Symmetry: D2
């Protein structure tokens, strides 16, 4: 974006605003445009726009002035060519898949894929004849193999993963894929464009869930997809049809929340790391998952491709479904709810929160244990948070 | 909804508010809830919810207090069992189709189908092996024939139609379809739940584009699908995956706009009718399309299943692409833009506005003429509008 | 404003938007500008603005792009030279008084003055030595007398009045006051800029409470003051110091609500009138107050300076505090609350609602009877409303 | 507030929300309540509320659910008994002055008082016979003298001061005042409830300007007044008449902004201090103002009653009106505008920005030099900022 703006924090603030907005004003902030359509002065100009000689969104489903600002902002952060914003993260992945993978094509992902996204790939895509290969996050051989057996169209995965924060060597993975013509998409939701530049490491596309860290206030939903124009534009087209447009009000709520992205992330990164160690050393804590820890499987990877390790920390308590529940019920600061990344701390038992519909055996079939607890550290003072977590574990 | 409320106008105002809200308040209006998730007091309760013993949206993608109000509101008007709201009309149709029509299945629609909706059906659905039969809005024999030849899954169409406002005998069409097991979905955007009750006439589902008349202020987009629970719920499920959630801020903007629905519709209904006749009798106007006119192909049907004929009026000027434009360029009150149904009057040349990408020949291939002009009468004073249209016509 | 615009309805919609906004956009609606300050490109320009060579609001407390629109909009309706918008109606009257009336000066108002306003004039102004003469709305002799005895600075009153909707011959009163140099300010809240033009009748300043009819949806508070520049500017200056600025989000909610002012007012005007007569003829109704009725004291004046008679109707039930309450408690459509002018209907007993702090004797000291009931007719269907009122009247 | 939260940061986040809201929900954030009035179920209950047996706001001008949350939140931070929120900072001071000081009373303030506030005290208050004594911020003897000569009603001042960030020994000043029965009001705007607790130091009332640091995003205006109930309630009463109510939307924007108050403040405190030194050592900088420096007149006081020194830094460049301007015109990150405290950095020449109307002689008569430059450090990265300031300093 700007030369005088070299830090990501400065970018997250003035990116797409300080130098101009396209919607002129002497105001410091971006104006919210609540319009469903855009007019033209005369039929002559309408034709001009229709003939690529003029610029206009024409209709609200094809864009919005207050929305593009956030599109450019995130684009600068990720250092992408273009960024597309949708109603939600799910909408982003969904549309992207439906737009890039052709019928009958093949897809490759990890076993730790977000549940809902797994369902979409195992129940909807097959309808278009799309087949998929599910490998382990670390199993690079499996990827290389599948890369040769069938013709892979695109390798999709998130890093860190949910809920075990498993990381993928983006640089490597990308190289293997591009070697066989496969595409690579990374869901850096947990990471944040501040803790890692998936695009700079080789990924073709990087999508986020503004609902989490980008918004950071737990009050709005949004989808994010950044990458090269040639690509992002293909998705944008299908988007203009499926109509999963983001409301201008929401767009501003995110622009606003991003003004303090770096500040929030910085604090969440510490509290998370510091509390992880404390938890790891705790006698009542059986296992702790965090890329920052030395005990993490891909700790060497995370350390090589990340500058931070996120504010999300998962760990298994030394008890059972009931005891573990007793622990979370004891906390007093975090909310017992889904989602994560907001100023307010949140806790939940993935076993109950997102897999209660399955049987204990089917649950265990995929790592989720009644022991697993996912803590999303807010922005509250460390001491207050630490004391709370400890006070809770005591009752166990 | 209420017994003391026997009129749609009264309903559109208090339906889903006067009796209760689920979100208690001594406030007259519905509170906007800007949240991404919902918390639980204790693991115990969380389980209860998961075991269908307690109620909660859990996550913002699965619902919202300020959104269900609008959902119940619209459900009362259409006299439906349940209503689902999306980010936009296109999202509504799109999701509904992907959810109800199975792979390899067959679909039936009209030739006047909304352009973008046509594209989705002719380029995306085929990927799932879904084939379609396109018939003329009036050709009931074609429908009956198709109903017997191939196994029709669902008959989709809008009524009135765009831009020639063609109408379908909903009652009849429903009968034929249901006889063969087909589903019927009517797009009553142009109509409005006030001018007709597609659900009462026999349709299974009725969808709208709150972006138009329901909102009425040209400042927000939204999708609408009302129908039986068994059906609408199936859609809601795929919706929870595709993630086309509607923002609470937008949901309120619609709730508010609907408070004056009946009043707006009433006025537009008149302005349109009166202006249509005046236009028809005008020497410079070659043809006029409006269900309210006796010259309309299905005026008899419109008169039998409608109480109003919308505020949209299409007509052909006595000139060419250039002359017609000169007419619209002379208008001073309406805006030259897409969309319709807002308090502000709008005008456009479908030919240019939504078919400029096609050749003159390919355009004529489907009724669109450089002569056609679609007028969306706002809520301005009739005399002011009439005088403007006349003064303008006085130039061609 | 516009030449092609000759009807208030059309004006209330496009006034201050259709021709230009000062904040350029190809958007149909007015954009919301959420800013606390406005920047300058270079010290040179800042100086220009300070030297009155350039335009700018500088600070949010001094103006806002999305607010002026509303200022100009209302200015057109009242045909005023300039309009000022504040936080609330009380804010407007308050600031206006403090600004125009000098210390030790004298004021003249009616006995039916709005309570709160009465308190301000009887407890605050005296601190600045400002004395006041209170006369009866109709007593023109008293006004003329006071006009000669003391040196009146400004005559302030509302018309219709609350809650007895008393009217004042603006034309006459204005004439008498201007003869002695006194200023005249009318509070046309109940009337609405559609039902009467106080400015055209001779008044110097006309103020409203957008909170009521202008907003029309019972979801925002705002003040209104329209009149000559020389005058309104003087108020604006004190405003910039007392800081009762109006939030941009609020300004838009009103701009939006006004797009259907004429439509709403039209409907309320009828329902009110019709329901007034029905009520008058009812055996259980002792008295009914409404300028539209022939039994109203200033019906001849109302009939001469108004085109409508508002949507507010006051009447006394044939019972007591307890009985009358039983009546309002029987209603099902209207809300038991203060305020009026919104789409939703509202009822209340001034006695209890705004005079419960006074003794029965002190209450009757100024017309308020435990009998009095103020009905604010919403926009719901007449039949639904009528049936409701009549039904609850069969339980007395 | 809470016993498990002892840090201000955690307080600024959950204060007034984590334990309850008064407006029940399972939502994590506070709901925005857009309503002008509040209803009652039956006349019986209406009476209960009027007789202090039930709770209700009755009318929007008297309170709002989404507003009180902010009232209680700031109350916790300041450790006050109650907080009142208005439309703007000016409103707060103005109303607090008109409510606490009686007619003919005496007031005491400093020479560095906020300009607009000075005007109000020097032009409006005298109309009520209220006289004032202006002393120098440091001059304690003057205060002690004035405290004995005339009968001081209230001593009002800010600390730090604008623009020379002069500080006042709150503890001391409080003692002398209370000894003679005077009241003490501190405008801790520049300080922020995080850097100092004027209330705990002895102040009777501490008022802010949420428009600055509290909101921290330069997109909303708001006034703050915290202190004991007996006192704050007296103001709230006059407030209910002057009608400077705060819009719920604005209230939410602050509640949200305060979620990252500590984070923002923390960063701004550093940058400012660090840059303050570098600037002081700079050869082109003649003088620097900042309570954090050892060169500041009341650095010993600042150090004893503050934990931070604000993000505002004033300094004089080695040049003239024209040269100084050249420097600000060279900057690229901060905006040239009024206000301060937001994420975005801002700069201005008080001489031009707020004193251009006065003569060079009249300006200097009160310290304002054509040299003075007030820098409001945003939240951008220090390095980026530092480099910018330096770069524009070499242009000189
Ligand atoms: C948040 C999230 C999503 C989906 O985001 P929505 O906002 O719910 O649409 C998908 N994947 C991961 C890994 C997430 O954390
Ligand atoms: C407006 C409209 C749609 C699509 O609405 P969106 O709000 O753009 O999704 C579909 N069909 C018809 C007939 C419409 O008029
Ligand atoms: C509504 C009203 C006011 C004050 O309006 P607010 O919105 O409460 O500030 C003053 N006078 C009359 C006659 C009103 O009806
Ligand atoms: C910002 C400020 C005020 C007034 O704030 P407004 O938002 O302009 O009302 C008063 N005093 C000081 C010292 C301020 O910094
Ligand atoms: O708890 C979760 O796993 C989660 N994470 C992110 C977004 C939403 C959720 C909730 P779920 O999938 O159970 O519907
Ligand atoms: O102009 C139209 O046909 C129209 N109508 C309704 C909604 C949106 C549009 C614009 P588009 O060309 O992109 O289809
Ligand atoms: O009921 C009323 O008198 C009324 N009217 C208009 C606005 C507000 C009110 C309520 P209050 O008693 O507080 O003055
Ligand atoms: O620049 C200022 O002095 C300032 N400070 C705080 C709030 C507002 C301002 C702008 P003004 O010139 O009008 O006083």
């Amino acid at each position: 974006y700007a030369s005088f703006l070299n830090s990501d924090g400065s970018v997250a603030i003035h990116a797409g605003e300080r130098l101009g907005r396209g919607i002129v004003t002497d105001a410091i902030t971006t104006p919210v445009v609540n319009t469903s359509a855009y007019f033209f002065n005369k039929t002559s100009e309408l034709i001009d726009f229709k003939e690529k000689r003029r610029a206009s969104f024409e209709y609200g489903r094809y864009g919005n002035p207050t929305t593009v600002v956030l599109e450019e902002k995130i684009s600068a952060l990720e250092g992408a060519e273009s960024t597309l914003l949708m109603a939600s993260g799910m909408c982003a992945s969904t549309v992207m898949l439906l737009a890039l993978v052709p019928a009958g094509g093949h897809i490759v992902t990890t076993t730790d894929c977000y549940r809902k996204t797994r369902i979409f790939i195992e129940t909807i895509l097959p309808k278009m004849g799309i087949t998929a290969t599910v490998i382990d996050p670390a199993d690079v051989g499996a990827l290389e193999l599948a890369l040769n057996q069938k013709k892979v169209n695109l390798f999709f995965t998130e890093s860190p993963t949910n809920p075990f924060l498993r990381c993928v060597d983006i640089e490597l993975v990308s190289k293997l894929c591009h070697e066989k013509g496969a595409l690579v998409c990374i869901d850096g939701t947990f990471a944040t464009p501040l803790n890692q530049k998936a695009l700079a490491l080789g990924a073709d596309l990087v999508l986020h869930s503004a609902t989490k860290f980008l918004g950071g206030h737990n009050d709005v939903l949004a989808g994010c997809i950044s990458g090269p124009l040639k690509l992002v534009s293909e998705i944008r087209n299908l988007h203009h049809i499926l109509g999963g447009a983001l409301n201008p009000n929401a767009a501003y709520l995110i622009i606003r929340g991003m003004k303090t992205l770096h500040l929030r992330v910085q604090q969440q990164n510490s509290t998370a790391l510091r509390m992880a160690e404390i938890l790891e050393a705790h006698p009542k804590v059986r296992h702790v998952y965090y890329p920052g820890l030395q005990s993490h499987p891909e700790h060497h990877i995370a350390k090589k491709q990340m500058t931070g390790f996120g504010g999300a920390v998962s760990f298994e308590v030394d008890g059972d479904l009931l005891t573990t529940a007793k622990f979370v019920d004891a906390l007093k600061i975090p909310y017992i709810a889904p989602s994560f990344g907001g100023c307010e701390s949140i806790v939940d038992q993935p076993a109950i929160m997102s897999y209660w519909d399955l049987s204990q055996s089917d649950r265990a079939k995929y790592g989720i244990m009644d022991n697993l607890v996912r803590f999303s550290f807010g922005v509250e003072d460390f001491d207050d948070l630490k004391a709370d977590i400890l006070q809770a574990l005591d009752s166990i």
